Amino acid sequence: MDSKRTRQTYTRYQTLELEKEFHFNRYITRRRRIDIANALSLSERQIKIWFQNRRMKSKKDRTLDSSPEH
């Protein structure tokens, strides 16, 4: 039938798949980001913004003088 799977919007699963890429490549290769964006099904735009955000997502961020702020 038709398909297109979620250009925007996220789930625990989706975010998990994104997370296990993010710890791989905090900046993904465009190939991998396209691949993921295809198979995972969340847009290149989205994943750019998600990964761009993630950097400073105010927990995975503020290792205060490299301490585990956790």
Curated annotation (Swiss-Prot):
Residues 3-62 bind DNA. Expressed early in development in a striped pattern at the blastoderm stage. Later expressed in a specific subset of neuronal precursor cells, neurons and glia in the developing CNS. Between 5 and 6 hours of development, found in the midline precursor-2 cells in a segmentally repeating pattern. Expression in many other neuronal precursors follows and reaches a second peak of abundance at 9 hours of development. Expressed in the hindgut between 11-15 hours of development. It comes from the Eukaryota. It is found in: Nucleus. 'Fushi tarazu' means 'segment deficient' in Japanese. Flies lacking ftz exhibit embryos with half the usual number of body segments. May play a role in determining neuronal identity, may be directly involved in specifying identity of individual neurons. Required during embryogenesis for the process of body segmentation. Homeotic protein, required in alternating segment primordia, it specifies the correct number of segments. Belongs to the Antp homeobox family. This is Segmentation protein fushi tarazu. It comes from Drosophila melanogaster (Fruit fly). The chain holds residues 253 to 321 of 410 of the full protein.
